[PDB]
Amino acid sequence: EVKLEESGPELVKPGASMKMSCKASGYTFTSYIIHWLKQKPGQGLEWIGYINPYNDGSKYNEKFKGKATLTSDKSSSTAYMELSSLASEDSAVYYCTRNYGSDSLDYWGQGTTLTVSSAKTTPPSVYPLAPSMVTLGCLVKGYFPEPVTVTWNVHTFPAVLQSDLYTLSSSVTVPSSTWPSETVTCNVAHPASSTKVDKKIVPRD
Amino acid sequence: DIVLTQTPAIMSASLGERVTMTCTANSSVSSNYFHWYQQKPGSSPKLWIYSTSNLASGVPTRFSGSGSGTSYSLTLSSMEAEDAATYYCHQYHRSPPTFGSGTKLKMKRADAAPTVSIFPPSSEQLTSGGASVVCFLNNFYPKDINVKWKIDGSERQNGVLNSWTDQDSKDSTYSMSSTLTLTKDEYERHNSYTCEATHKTSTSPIVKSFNRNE
Numbered sequence A: 001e002v003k004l005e006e007s008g009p010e011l012v013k014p015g016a017s018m019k020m021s022c023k024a025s026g027y028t029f030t031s032y033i034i035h036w037l038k039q040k041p042g043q044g045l046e047w048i049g050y051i052n053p054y055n056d057g058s059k060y061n062e063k064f065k066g067k068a069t070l071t072s073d074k075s076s077s078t079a080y081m082e083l084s085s086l087a088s089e090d091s092a093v094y095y096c097t098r099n100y101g102s103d104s105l106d107y108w109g110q111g112t113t114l115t116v117s118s119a120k121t122t123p124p125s126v127y128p129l130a131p132s133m134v135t136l137g138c139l140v141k142g143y144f145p146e147p148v149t150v151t152w153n154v155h156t157f158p159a160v161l162q163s164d165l166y167t168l169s170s171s172v173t174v175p176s177s178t179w180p181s182e183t184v185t186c187n188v189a190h191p192a193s194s195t196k197v198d199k200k201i202v203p204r205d
Numbered sequence B: 001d002i003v004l005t006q007t008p009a010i011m012s013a014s015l016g017e018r019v020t021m022t023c024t025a026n027s028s029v030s031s032n033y034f035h036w037y038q039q040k041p042g043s044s045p046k047l048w049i050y051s052t053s054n055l056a057s058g059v060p061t062r063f064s065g066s067g068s069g070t071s072y073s074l075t076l077s078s079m080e081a082e083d084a085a086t087y088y089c090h091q092y093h094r095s096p097p098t099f100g101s102g103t104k105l106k107m108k109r110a111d112a113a114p115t116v117s118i119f120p121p122s123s124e125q126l127t128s129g130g131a132s133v134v135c136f137l138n139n140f141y142p143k144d145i146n147v148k149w150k151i152d153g154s155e156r157q158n159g160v161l162n163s164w165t166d167q168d169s170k171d172s173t174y175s176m177s178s179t180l181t182l183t184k185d186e187y188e189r190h191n192s193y194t195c196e197a198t199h200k201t202s203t204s205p206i207v208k209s210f211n212r213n214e
C-alpha cells in the first residue's frame, strides 16, 4: 500500500535553514509528482511547490521560489524540502502528498511541524495532581518546543504557550478502590529534549 | 492563485441532518480539476471527493459532490459523528493550485453539564517556588463556558491558562483545563482556592474548592 513517511518535528533558530524529508513507498517513485504544502494552525493549505522525480524538475509558487528548494533521491525514494532564512512566520505544519488523477492529492504524509523560534529547548517539569469515580491528573509545565506525549500507567489537553514555555495537563478518571492503594503514574515524553518523566500520583500530607 | 471562498465557515449539525457546503471561485475552474478534502484535528487531510463528484476510496455514499464553473458544493445526506471535520475545496485549473479556508462541520448534541475537579499545587512544584492550581471541566456541551477563579472569595484573572479539547470522537462533548499559576509566596498567603464554572446547563455555577487547612 502507498505510504509517505515524513521526518520528525524540528525546532530551528531564526535565520537558519532546515531540510525535511518524505520517504515514499508502495508505488513507482518516478511515476508520480509529489507536492509540498504549508498549513498554519487554524488555517487552510498553502501550496509551496512540487517535485517530479522522473526528471528532477520542481515547480514553485512564486511566493516560495526563493525560500524553498525541492529535491529528490531516486535511490531511496525520498523527496526533500529545504526552507531557508527561516523566521516566525515559517512555523507551520508541512505536508508532502502524491499527485493522482486530475491532480487530486490522494496520499498524504503525516505532516512535519516546524517551529521557528529563538527560545531554548527545555524539558518539562511534571507535577502530580492529587485530590466512586476519582479524577487524577498531571501538570506538564515549563517545556519547549512541542510536542509532549502523555501516557497513563483520559483527557489530554492541547498545550498553551506563555513566555516561550508550554503548559499542558492531562486528567484521568479511575474508581476509588484503585487509588491510592495502587500506584498511578503519568508518563511524559518530550522527544525534542530526549527526556521522559515517570511521575507517581502521590496523595497529599 | 485563484481565490476559493467556502461557506459556511463554521456550522453544526445533529445526527441525521442533511448538510450542504459551498465553495465559490473568483474565476471559472474545470470540474475535472476540482477536489475536496476532509481533515480532522492533529491529522493530515484525506482526499474525499475528486473531479467534482467521484468519492475517494473508503468515503461513505452519504457524501456527494456537485458543481461547475465557479460554484461547487459537497453534500452530506445524513450527519454522523465521524463526519465532524473541516472540509476543504481545491482547484488545480491553474498553477499555483489553491484551496479554500474550510468549512468546519461540528456535531450538535444534547446539553451536558461539566464534571469539575480542582487540584492544589504539588509539594514538588512548591519546592521550586511555583504554585499552580488546576481545574478540569470535563465532558460538557455546548462549548461556551466561563471559568472563574477565586482566592479567599476574591476573583483572580491574571495567570490563568485555559485549554479546550476538540469534540470527543465518541460522545461529542468538550473538556477544558484551567491552570492558575501564582508564586509560592502569593499562594501560601491565602487559604481557599475556588474554581467556578458557569454553563447553560445550570442557573447556579458548578463550584469546587480546597483550603490549605486539609
Ligand SMILES: *[C@@H]1O[C@H](CO)[C@@H](O)[C@H](O)[C@H]1NC(C)=O
Binding pocket: B003, B026
Ligand atoms: C474574489 O471575489 C470576492 C467576492 O465577490 C471579492 O470581494 C474579492 O476581492 C475577490 N478577490 C480577488 C483577488 O480578486
